[PDB]
Subunit: 212 residues, 4 copies
């Protein structure tokens, strides 16, 4: 009868704010996490608020298209930032090349880590506008696929399971790199928590085929 939608919370950074120095600044982490990521969480919740109010009869009409777009963009922002932080680890700890199933999967689907790294780097550097590059697991095939995302919710589609994501909205790098997205993406390699990615990939491998 009465709808109470579960709202979104800003997850804590998985490390302290200078953990990614000198590749990503504490300052970038503060803006990026506590302001931009927070904004997407809040934007997602604000859609949910409109929906709820409509469904519980406090709002008479709702612009379902606008609320959908709002929800989806901001939820995309939330989930992708959440992934993004998880995918990184202190400059010491993360980085280097993946081992385990993920490393093997990358070799299988891109030939080598270096060929993957190159194509993935280029996918990130060549997001037109702002967005993301994502290494995803395709449940249909079991193949890894590189995706781009523009904004948080254009170009990307469903069912693909993102394992690793790099944000190339300018705010991810502008404080530290200004316009030099390329030099950001290049260095971001050294922050990758490949265990995190591995663990996600293991989970992905064991998700039931939902559609096909």
């Amino acid at each position: 009868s009465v709808v109470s939608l579960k709202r979104y919370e800003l997850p804590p950074l998985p490390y302290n704010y200078d953990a990614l120095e000198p590749i990503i600044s504490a300052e970038t982490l503060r803006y990026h996490h506590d302001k931009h990521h927070l904004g997407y969480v809040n934007g997602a919740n604000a859609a949910l608020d409109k929906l709820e109010k409509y469904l519980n009869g406090q709002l008479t009409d709702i612009d379902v298209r606008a609320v959908s777009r709002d929800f989806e963009f901001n939820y995309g922002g939330h989930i992708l930032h959440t992934l993004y932080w998880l995918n990184m680890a202190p400059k010491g700890k993360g980085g280097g090349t993946p081992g385990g199933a993920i490393g093997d999967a990358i070799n299988k689907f891109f030939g080598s880590f270096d060929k993957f790294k190159k194509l993935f780097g280029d996918a990130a550097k060549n997001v037109e506008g702002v967005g993301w590059a994502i290494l995803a697991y395709d449940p249909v095939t079991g193949d890894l696929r590189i995706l781009q995302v523009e904004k948080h919710n254009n170009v990307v589609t469903t069912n693909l399971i993102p394992l690793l994501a790099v944000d190339v909205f300018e705010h991810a790098y502008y404080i530290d790199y200004r316009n030099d997205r390329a030099k950001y993406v290049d260095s971001w390699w050294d922050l990758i928590n490949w265990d995190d990615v591995e663990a996600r990939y293991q989970k992905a491998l064991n998700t039931p085929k939902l559609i096909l």
Copy 2:
């Protein structure tokens, strides 16, 4: 070393081609499934072909943005059509209102089946341009969420698990309804295989939280 990407296949319709009459014509099913859906499968595979050729060194350069966009749009087309067919059942068998966990989940998150039906119908009817309305499971919250999708890969974002989808590209209805998307979406309710949706929702409920 040598990449061999797993290509996509056009799944068989889950019923004969006049199974959805008089709501959706055999003719629509023939065009929609065997031509449009096929085209997305083929378009997805053609991206994979470019990627492979690039990665195995037959193509020197690849436009990673273009191949990404191509892959994602067409894969979206494939997966969403695949869902779409599965979500329907002969005019006899499917339709009516959901029971089981899904029916309860709809009541919980939209108040009633009728409030959901109204909002979902409006989400479909008010896709701007062409796209989809999707009833999805949000693994983060356990909430159902209504999404829109424009094309197969705009507005939508990742992580959300689509349970039920209605295509509102014009080709889904134009043969049978011409411009009257609304009358199509209204009738499409009578084709819903709610067991299919239930089964997907059960699977969704038991997918490990991938991100958050």
Copy 3:
């Protein structure tokens, strides 16, 4: 003080409804012009209504993003359909290859009419999803440019002056060609009112450089 925004009208078809047979059906013209084009006009006006009501204080708040998107999509729909109809002429009268400044301009910028026709046809056939191909005049350079448009208001940008446009939303062709957009675009060549295009191009040539 009191805002009264000028609303949009559906312009009359520039020929009777069977004027484009057998390439485009009267039936297609009826749906396409009197329903789809009308819908964009109405959608554009409905945005204007929200804006006005907001600005004159009848609506307290407005979702400026949503109204902007609404206005722009539908205005795009209106203006592009308006162009589209004007660009065609009875199967007898229109068609063939352009002479005058436009024909020369096409030769200059694409090498030959056949090279232009091929690339323009391919641009139309390869709109991903629905949209338009447009032959535009670039005031900055004086060059013709081929554009795509997705929906009526994605991919395209401002300042470019559209001269000739072909709609490849499915509704432009589905009644007559079903999924065979290609065969539609191929035949649409025979409807082009090249004088209309010429006249527009003359006007374009004599528009003051607005920006650059």
Copy 4:
């Protein structure tokens, strides 16, 4: 016979690089103009290069969709930045409220400068992702319309004549305002060269109705 497409040039800033201090930094102007704007010019030209090479037979096949998208995004970037710079004037000289036909037009279509300023500010602040807010002249009606643009070439459509544009890609403000787009847009008001806008609006008023 042989196509030689006219490429794009980066126009000079219409003032020295610290002319907009303290609202927009010299540093922002250097990155924004000499790197980001330059990048769009170059990206536009690189599309033109592919087109030319294809048309003159040096490239066998072209991905017309990809080149179209590339051209349109970057040309949008070029033309909109070009407008953006022109629309600003040293903190001394520009700013305040418009007089002349433009000031009257704003009063006519938004009620008052303050109502316009509020709605326009909100349109800029509420671009989802990155893009632009634009005050445009609608040749069809003679009405001013506020547009949003996402990236340089989404949401916007043709025929509308942009008079005034504010960039809300993060790079327009991030150096000076970090995430505080709102405080940027608010201050940007003080840089508006309203004479520039007036002059453009005069030109717009005297452009022949191209379509309708």
